[PDB]
């Protein structure tokens, strides 16, 4: 329509680049196993992530502003303009990723983006209820936070930008109409640790700012970060997750909310099984495929029938921490 022409013509962009040196070291880093034997600890994973980011930043020679809610309150530290923003396990701390992206500066972020719907991340048990991850840090408190969908398709993002109260007064009449000052970013996530596949090393570069119309679509269909909806609308009380394997396999993870048991299966198998008429047929087919483990077939059958169980909340005793 002619409205599309308005958006196409109205570029009015102001590209800004404070010579942010591309951090090619973070991009294209081979998978690594931090723990020589056994399984790594959460503190060890955090230390490895910090060391990797530190080495990259120092090798490039840039500066950094580590964050350890709506405003970062960077004034108390006043870092340089060219310095990067680095955050580790700050999902609980930051209300939104927009808080980090308003600064219109490159962001290096190590986050929790699970590929299993429940289980252990390193030594830290975690579980998803409603749509909030009930993470339990090994040697720490209990974190309750959502996941902000870093790994969905699309490299271009829309985010807010910093605005003062005077700027707020200036733009509020324009804001209510549907006019927003939107910055654009390019995302890269690496997934660098094999033993802990639930944590992603997100990397981001800003590209340029733009004024956009709220009630007008975009030709490139740029997306803005949204909270993930783990709940399965077809089977109440169940969480469903899909992810793509490196060997060209589209697996799916199923499980109940506020619950520990979890199984991964090829998506095609789940779609075939979800249409079977009888419960006994599910077991017959699963035995046909060669799955003899009861823990697998029983969970598949329970998902097929949508069995809801009100599991209780019970006291937990956590592993003793050792500084080493």
């Amino acid at each position: 329509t002619r409205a599309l022409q308005r958006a196409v013509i109205d570029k009015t962009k102001t590209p800004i680049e404070t010579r942010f040196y591309p951090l090619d070291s973070l991009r294209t880093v081979t998978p690594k196993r931090v723990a020589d034997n056994g399984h790594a600890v959460s503190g060890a994973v955090r230390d490895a992530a910090r060391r990797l980011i530190d080495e990259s930043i120092t090798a490039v020679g840039g500066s950094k502003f580590e964050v350890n809610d709506l405003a970062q309150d960077f004034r108390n530290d006043t870092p340089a303009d060219d310095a990067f923003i680095v955050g580790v396990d700050v999902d609980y701390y930051v209300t939104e990723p927009d808080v980090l992206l308003e600064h219109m500066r490159p962001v290096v972020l190590h986050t929790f983006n699970p590929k299993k719907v429940s289980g252990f991340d390193a030594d830290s048990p975690f579980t998803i209820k409603n749509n909030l991850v009930e993470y339990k840090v090994s040697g720490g408190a209990a974190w309750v936070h959502p996941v902000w969908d870093w790994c969905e398709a699309g490299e271009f993002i829309a985010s807010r930008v910093r605005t003062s109260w005077k700027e707020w007064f200036l733009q509020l009449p324009l804001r209510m109409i549907g006019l927003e000052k939107v910055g654009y970013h390019k995302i890269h996530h690496c997934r660098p640790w094999t033993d802990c596949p639930d944590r992603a090393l997100v990397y981001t570069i800003p590209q340029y700012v733009i004024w956009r119309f709220n009630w007008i679509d975009t030709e490139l269909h740029v997306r803005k970060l949204k909270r993930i909806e783990y709940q399965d609308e077809t089977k109440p009380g169940w969480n469903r997750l899909e992810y793509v394997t490196d060997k060209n396999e589209l697996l799916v993870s199923i499980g109940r909310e506020g619950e520990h048991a979890q199984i991964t299966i090829e998506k095609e198998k789940l779609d075939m099984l979800s249409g079977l008429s009888a419960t006994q047929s599910v077991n017959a087919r699963l035995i046909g495929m060669g799955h003899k483990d009861p823990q697998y077939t029983s969970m598949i059958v329970q998902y097929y029938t949508g069995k809801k169980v009100v599991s209780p909340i019970s006291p937990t005793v956590y592993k003793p921490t050792m500084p080493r």
């Binding site: 010579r19 040196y21 230390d47 490895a48 060391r51 080495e55 020679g61």
Partner: protein, 333 residues
Amino acid sequence: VANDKKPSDRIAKIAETFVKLMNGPFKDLDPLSIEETIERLLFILKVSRYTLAYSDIVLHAEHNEHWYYPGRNPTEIADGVCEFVSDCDAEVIETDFSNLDGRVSSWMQRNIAQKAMVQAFRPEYRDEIISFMDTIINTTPHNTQYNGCVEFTALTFEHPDAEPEDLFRLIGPKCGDDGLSRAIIQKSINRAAKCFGLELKVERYNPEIGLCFLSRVFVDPLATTTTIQDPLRTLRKLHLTTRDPTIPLADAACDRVEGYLCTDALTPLISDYCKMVLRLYGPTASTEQVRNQRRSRNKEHPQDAHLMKQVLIKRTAIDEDQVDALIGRFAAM
């Protein structure tokens, strides 16, 4: 043979402390102009323009003269070696690396050399230097930086409770693939090399067989500074000439013996060979101005003469009567 053996977590702090001590008081630097680089001392020029300035500024500073021997005249090298051996009371160890440029890991390259260059040079030149380092990853200063890093790691492992500045102040002379260190870390040096992923060869100092350093043999470093070409490396191969086929044998032999006279005039078992080469190939060689105008020309203390003779005999494990017989045979040919 490329290697990607990243070091351990603990070693990273030691490497960062060593890099900071290398930085010292020279926070800011500026690149050199092309003309100045050209008159200093293609592909070599683009990296040299920055690396020569970086070496001259930081590596040749007041607080970095303790270890960066590479970059001084041979008389200065001999003086430094004699001073170091006098300080260590003839208790020193030698390091011999095999294909260091072919064995340094990506983590070491990007956390020692790149870090040092970026900290030394101005921020406005960061992109050029980082691009040059990236091109390098996929000359002389790199070997010195690796040797300094390994020395700092050994010193940190030996005395983990001392301050890093005091630890680094004890760094002995180092020059590329060759260097000197205290003998008290002879066994612990291998473990440090394994942690970094490098291969190290170490030999205890022995006055009977002399000391090996920069292919130079110190006959008696305790008292005299007299020094000679390494006999072990050259005697077994001096009879064969590795010059290109286009050069006549006489010119190559004449250049070799001229260099030997310039460096090893009074060394036993080499002076006789040099004189016999000059006597045989000399008259049959071409004009010396012709070879001075030819590209392949550059492609090559009397008081302790007795002691130098005995030290050479000990180095070559040849009996004195056998040495005299060999000398007589060489002269009479």
